Design a protein around this ligand. Structure first.
Ligand SMILES: [C-]#N
Ligand SMILES: [C-]#N
Ligand SMILES: [C-]#N
Ligand SMILES: [C-]#N
Ligand SMILES: [C-]#N
Ligand SMILES: [C-]#N
Ligand SMILES: [C-]#N
Ligand SMILES: [C-]#N
Ligand SMILES: [C-]#N
Ligand SMILES: [C-]#N
Ligand SMILES: [C-]#N
Ligand SMILES: [C-]#N
Ligand SMILES: [C-]#N
Ligand SMILES: [Fe+3]
Ligand SMILES: [Fe+3]
Ligand SMILES: [Fe+3]
Ligand SMILES: [Fe+3]
Lengths: 238, 202, 238, 238, 202, 238, 202, 238, 202
């Protein structure tokens, strides 16, 4: 198989750059349209991260920062698969996640929300997908976060995630939410996404059969990245 | 995700398919039975016998019973056993039998199992897992057989202690006896009523 | 992969123990609720049956008991797959089946139904599933069986089956029926099952493309057993 | 009441003579259209069969051929009413039936199907309808019959029947099937019938209330023949 | 109003149910056959024989045939006959037979029927109503057999004259012959092709 | 016609024995299932009551107890047909009825309801069905009856009825209500009946065309009893 | 086909309609009662008495009872009886009674029935069919009364032997007694609990 | 795995031989029905074509005939999978295709349509499916073809294809069309196919994600062939 | 389960894609043709020729024909052949040709195939499987070519004997001839009408 370029990103499946409902985007969005280019080696390549660099608790947010005891909050396991748009699994992709604690408080200097800090919770983890594109980490379910878009704005509970895979063109950062959260229907950030089907693509589903008795609940969340087309005739990439 | 195939009663003639011999049907050369002790099987031979009573106190004469147990060193002859120990190479660990059509008594010739590791580094008292099928029983009933000569181990057993009604724990303890030079554990099962045997959802 | 415990059996997908419509269950059902326990090695292990012990006709009910000639009745092949709830195939599982003959008569001492016995039919077979969880046997389609629940009760045509697989917790015995049988809608035993979707999970489907011309018809029937969850953090099974 | 002629047969309620889907009909169907004629005494008359000629077991296919024992198969009773299109009962009509055995094997020299013969089953019976047009016989439910139309063709279970009543114009031979049989929807012979309502007119219905406990099941099947119009003015039949 | 039960082919094994004897099945004491002439039957005995050919010109060796006719005086042994005349008390007027599995020939031993009244005071030429059933035939085919020695009557026959294609009328006329001292009418039926026999919807 | 046994009673068309919603049934219901038996002469026979024993006013509840005057209340005629499940009329069956008066007061020592007694009303009648299974009696429409199941329980207006017919197996006692009564939808006794169609089988319908001007209203109410199957083969009843 | 009219409880005041006299209501000249023995009735007079107990062991004081039985020769005074024998012309074979409002006792004055033919040429032991109605009982409960002095007949009785729980059979046997010169059979009915009376679905 | 015979061809999923709407079929269709036979080695075997014989441009219709320049027309890539009815991929099957040019003109001596010939286009190609049953070729989208069935008949744009696979019984030749072509709904040839679902099985779907920017469009088209049943009991093929 | 892709006519210009040479199109280096005999091919060389006639008796001048046959020892050059025998390494066993645009004649240069095993231990007479495609033909028509010099083998051939209309069997037998020193089998195909060639659904 001789690979060509990644399929064109479908701009209609993503939020636009300019979204007045999300205030801070008004000054941080280009007024010019993006210039589309034909891909080269620069766009189809990406770095490789060796597993040797990862600590044993890097994907366990419940314990990777615990000092005197355990974090306060809902023990939940999150797992799923990372595939490309053509259904092919994405192997050894770097998945990084971060979030606020059970109070909805981020361990970040610029966060002054009155929600209480948890001395035993850090809020960040990472991991590499296996050969089947599978990933799994453990954490505390984050609480909603009150913020200033309109004065009484509230982000539904959410976990931030980032992926670096096989091609630079696949670079993606997003957020996923939890099934049932009512704040999902009123969030300005989630509404920047044009279609309803795409909004639902960011919702982690309760996976009851994979709950661990007297221990943790479980949510299933799959991620889809852009995929490469194979070449059977001229190969102009080079 | 798929749902488990729903259970149904084993039916009144359950012997045809699981114990052809008892139904006078010779079709298989090798027949599965209630004798788990082979020539070179390690451990002390024991006989497990009893009856199964319905809600009226009458024995079921059409019940089918199967047992699953570890060898003498508490290792299961199963690839799922993760103890890292070698199991008795001459022990299947499983057996099947039917109550007698006339009297209702059932029995197995087996070995007294060794202690098996429990969850979180605990140790389970010696026990035999047992299940019963029969007409009127929609889903196989699971229970365990413990031995009365293992009083100290039973007192510390995780599963027995997970039964909050202390009074019911005794229904899972078989009584030791000795016909001649053979050890026999009597274990009667009461499906309904007083002294109703404890059944588990495993 | 480090395996944990089998997923919890869903009691709502199974018939209750006490079902007044099925008379004999009134005295053979515990009055106490089942005590749920956390699994140990005892529940996750099971015996292994070597193929060496199986005769060549063990899965052929048409010939494994034939003496002077062939059994009288409808030649039918039944096949399908055995999977666990997570879709994984169940390999080398022991599948045992038994049934009445074409008259609806069981070769059992306690059966005095006037339906005629077939000297060339036994009614029992067995086999092990292959690496794909596939199984296949041949038999005579059983006739309905008149019985005494209410005086004029009739079991639809059915074949009894039993499975012993990888875990004792998967131990299961049930019955399957044939698509189209009208007695299916009035059977008290099949009605002990709460949901309609589960009742239909016991119906073998006509598989016309797999009929063997001028020989036998074919029914497709798949079986789903409980499945194990994998462990990625603490492993308390031991 | 002075009777006239039988109402015109409705050709659209019957299969056409030429039906390519049913192969053998290609060479055994007239290329010319049927010539319709006005009825005369020849068409409105028919023979009479005295009951004295019928043996006591003529309508009992379970016992009229039993030698050493009973036939193997499903004991079923079939009964119903024979009426004319105007709802009038058809009295003392000769009803003859024949069928294959429980294996789907016909006791006929030209049948070499591997299905097993039953030494205690003949496959034919007959009877006369009573004054209410009622009829009843007992038999073994026939098994489907594999045949060569397309190589893997299968007739659903069926019983052949023939009627000779009051008028030669009513002469009819057909087949009836059993409710629920899945082969009904794929049979080329049953499909030669143009309408769905007419196809269902050939299906015997399960009659549960008339089952005989620990003995036999029962199917209800009514037959409709052509009927005569009454004359109130000129009578040109003669 | 109800619709007529739809027709279906008689099937390849039609002999089992309508002619058990021909299928070597002895179940009935009294069997229906192709002999309509009894000891005291009135009229001149005649033998009706022939074959049935398919579209290829090949005889059907699995066809079943039945006939219905009046007695020697043209009266039908049927309560539906309104002639007011007394019928031959020793005549059923009906018969059934099957083609020979090997040769394909069929035959009946009967009596030559007398003239029967037609519609509107007309007179029908002597005839025998005949119907055929068989594999491949979805609905019994109706036809009539007239006799060639009744030329004058046939010319005035209402039914024959209702066939506008004069050429086809001859397909309904059997030919007289005389083996020894017996009268035989040969009547071949051609279901398809040239000289295709006329079939009626009665 | 040689009669066999009565068709099996369909337990699903009747209320169960144990119905917690109807309190007094908790201690007066067997814990064991009913034992179904094959019928004998004992079950297919029943007593005969001669018409000679019936007084002229036995079916007239308005006058059979009137002393000084007429009962106070709504004059209504109730009539209908008694048939067996196969539609055959039930001839000379004994039909006995009883009810409370217009106040909802029963003329029974154990009734202390404050509803007023009517010195001219008794509340009981009886009659035999004619050859067509027809019956007819006259009465006063009963008022609802307050009772102690839950403290504020109220029986809708109702008339109790009992039938003794041809077979002991047909013995039946029940109650019928009047179309439109709102209490029908909240009665615990009527709710012991599993299906809605069966509940409606106990509702007497207003029969306006049969009202008698300036005199009485009329309700139509038909009753269906179990029926016997006819026998055409072995007769094992004896 | 039509469905059977659904059953409903007889209700607390069931006496008004079925036993007016017991409710102090004189409306009928001829009242149905619990006395089946007439002046010229054949057979040995017997008194059948007992009580009906609920789940608490307390007698129902509002229950209604009816019985149906054959005469002394085992023939039912019913047109449905096909024995071809002549029945006792002075025997209705049926009776009705109510428990006493105070004590709870009920009774019938009848005759000990003769043996009645069973199915397939068998013979039923002498018995009386009995049914009970009452508040709290949604459907009349059917049962049978056998006699303890007919031990040999009872052992061979088809219906009694169709009860697989041998222990329950005794609940259907009444005990013979003799007040003075009269024969009395005591038959207590227990609707719920231990020694619960067997009830049939006929 | 021991293979048996190919499943019976379903005549109802194919056009009949005689189709008056398609004129030339009137004289080129047998009047006799096809004789169905049981398969033998002759029907289950087929030739093998080595890849060594295929030129490098055999599957590139844009360049395999280009002389002075490129063909005029719409550059399109067509790809898909060849499977058997049971979903198994068909490996190393010979796929041959041919078509008219962009004008709707065939490079065939008998074609005199005024549509213009393209000196740089031949109209034929071929290829072997890989191990996954995948195939891919490049061509110029053909223009509709006017023909004489009825005087103004027009074939929608179409590409002819032929397959020779594992069994002679799978031999198949057909045509596929392009999604959206309006002529599809009025073509007499496509209408010879009985069902609508089967007609749609011949329509190549636009596969936008696999378009090659500033170069070619892409259509997806899968092919299903007859499949073999496996044998587990008697093997009578030989 | 999936449905087979529906068939469609090969079309009037079928030569472009399957026989480019015949359409004057040189695009492939290696072209498939009607010559199955190679230098080292075993067996007796034979020439198979004939014409295809429509319903009017006129030859199709646009028909395409392909054949599939076993080698001289009755072994198919196919991995699906389970005979366990080694096949002629210099034999493809398949060929394709088109009728001549002017005369209508077609032909193949091949080898006379050896007998191939039939079902259930039978032996098939030597034969060549043939299929035809063309404008007007919606689905390729399957037929077989047998040889008249194999009379004894043909009489016992399973497929030929599965044709109940004995008269049609001859339509599948080609006639041997000898131009000079070469053997030629003439096989004409008649799609419609009299002597219509037998076509199979394989
Ligand atoms: C985050 N807010
Ligand atoms: C079934 N037993
Ligand atoms: C069977 N049950
Ligand atoms: C099984 N009954
Ligand atoms: C019948 N076939
Ligand atoms: C069937 N014949
Ligand atoms: C059979 N027909
Ligand atoms: C009434 N109550
Ligand atoms: C009302 N009793
Ligand atoms: C009132 N019951
Ligand atoms: C192409 N026509
Ligand atoms: C296009 N032929
Ligand atoms: C082009 N067909
Ligand atoms: Fe069963
Ligand atoms: Fe048939
Ligand atoms: Fe009341
Ligand atoms: Fe074309």
């Amino acid at each position: 198989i001789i690979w060509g370029a990644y399929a064109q990103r479908n701009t209609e499946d993503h939020p636009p750059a300019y979204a007045p409902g999300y205030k801070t985007s008004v000054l941080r969005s280009p007024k010019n349209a993006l210039i589309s280019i034909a891909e080269t080696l620069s766009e189809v390549t990406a770095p490789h991260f060796s597993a040797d660099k990862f600590g044993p608790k890097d994907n366990d947010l419940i314990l990777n920062y615990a000092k005197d005891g355990l974090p306060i909050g809902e023990r939940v396991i999150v797992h799923g698969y990372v595939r490309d748009q053509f259904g092919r699994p994405v192997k050894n992709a770097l998945v990084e996640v971060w979030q606020a604690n059970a109070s909805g408080r981020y361990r970040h200097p610029n966060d002054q929300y009155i929600g209480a800090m948890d001395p035993n919770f850090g809020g960040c983890g990472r991991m590499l997908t296996d050969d089947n594109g599978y990933y799994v980490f453990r954490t505390i379910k984050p609480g909603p976060y009150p913020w200033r878009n309109r004065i009484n704005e509230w982000r539904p509970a959410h976990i931030h995630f980032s992926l670096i895979a096989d091609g630079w063109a696949q670079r993606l950062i997003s957020q996923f939410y939890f099934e049932g959260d009512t704040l999902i229907d009123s969030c300005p950030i989630l509404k920047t996404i044009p279609s309803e089907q795409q909004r639902r693509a960011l919702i982690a589903l309760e996976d009851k059969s994979n709950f661990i008795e007297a221990d943790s609940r479980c949510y299933r969340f799959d991620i889809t990245l852009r995929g490469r087309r194979a070449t059977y005739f001229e190969n102009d990439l080079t | 995700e798929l749902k488990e195939t729903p259970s149904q009663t084993g039916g009144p003639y359950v012997h045809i398919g699981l114990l052809p011999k008892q139904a006078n049907i010779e079709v298989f050369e090798h027949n599965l039975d209630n004798n788990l002790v082979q020539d070179n099987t390690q451990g002390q031979r024991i006989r497990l016998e009893g009856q199964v009573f319905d809600g009226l106190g009458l024995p079921l004469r059409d019940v089918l019973i199967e047992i699953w147990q570890a060898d003498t060193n508490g290792v299961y002859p199963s690839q799922a056993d993760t103890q890292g120990k070698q199991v008795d190479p001459n022990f299947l660990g499983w057996g099947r039998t039917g109550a007698d059509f006339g009297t209702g008594f059932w029995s197995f010739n087996t070995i007294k199992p060794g202690a098996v590791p429990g969850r979180k580094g605990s140790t389970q008292a010696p026990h035999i897992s047992l299940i019963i099928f029969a007409r009127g029983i929609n889903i196989g009933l699971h229970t365990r057989v413990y031995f009365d000569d293992e009083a100290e181990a039973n007192a510390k057993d995780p599963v027995l202690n997970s039964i909050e009604w202390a009074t019911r724990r005794q229904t899972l303890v078989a009584k030791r006896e000795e016909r001649d030079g053979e050890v026999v554990y009597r274990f009667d099962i009461r499906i309904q009523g007083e002294n109703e045997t404890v059944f588990f959802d495993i």
